[PDB]
Amino acid sequence: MQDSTSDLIPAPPLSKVPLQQNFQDNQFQGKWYVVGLAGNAILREDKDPQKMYATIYELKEDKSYNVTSVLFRKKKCDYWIRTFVPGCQPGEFTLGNIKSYPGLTSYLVRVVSTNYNQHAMVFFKKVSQNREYFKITLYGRTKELTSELKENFIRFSKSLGLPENHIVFPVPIDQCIDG
């Protein structure tokens, strides 16, 4: 080292960090296909790639979401649920009961921009008693998306988020409706 190196990129603006308008819970609740995964505390290893899964957002008549994440087995798909609830208004939600929770310190969720006919992007941020990690995902609320969406998800995140940490889309297809 000790020579010209790669520190060219300037401070990345929020341009990769927009937020959904006043979209409503009562119609937003649905089932997306997990299509990319990036965060500072996320483990993307070439040796051990992450299989993609699915998650369904189901609102309840009490400004709250019960979210079902679907996973793949060798020939079965199973369900597990986490809850999400809007903070004070639409656009901001939290997970669990971090106010009442012991080792959960601060869980805030804010989807960036959805395109429910193609794709949507999530900004997930949370802390445990003393751990700080955040994750951003892109998934497909439709049966199919675009083949450009692969390069486009990398190039958009790359231009704004460069290769800072574990920010990639190690998510193949393998939709569980085909199994």
Experimental method reported for this structure = NMR
With contact defined as beta carbons under 8 Å apart, do 72 and 174 qualify? yes
| CA separation for the pair 102, 123 (Å, rounded) | 23
Whether residue 126 is annotated as binding a ligand: the answer is: yes
29, two tokens: 């609740």
Q: Which residues of 20-41 are buried (b: 16+ CB within 10 A; e: fewer)?
A: beeeebeebeeebbbbbbbbee
Place of tokens 């010209």: 4
What are the domain boundaries of the chain?
1-179
Whether residue 158 is annotated as binding a ligand: the answer is: no
Tally of CA atoms within 13 A in the half-sphere of 55 that contains its CB: 19
Whether residue 79 is annotated as binding a ligand: the answer is: no
169-174: long-range contacts, CB 8 A cutoff, minimum separation 24: 169/35, 169/36, 169/37, 169/38, 169/138, 170/37, 170/44, 170/49, 170/50, 171/34, 171/35, 171/36, 171/37, 171/50, 171/52, 172/49, 172/51, 172/52, 173/52, 174/51, 174/52, 174/72
Whether residue 53 is annotated as binding a ligand: the answer is: yes
Fold topology of 1-179? Lipocalin (2.40.128)
Whether residue 135 is annotated as binding a ligand: the answer is: yes
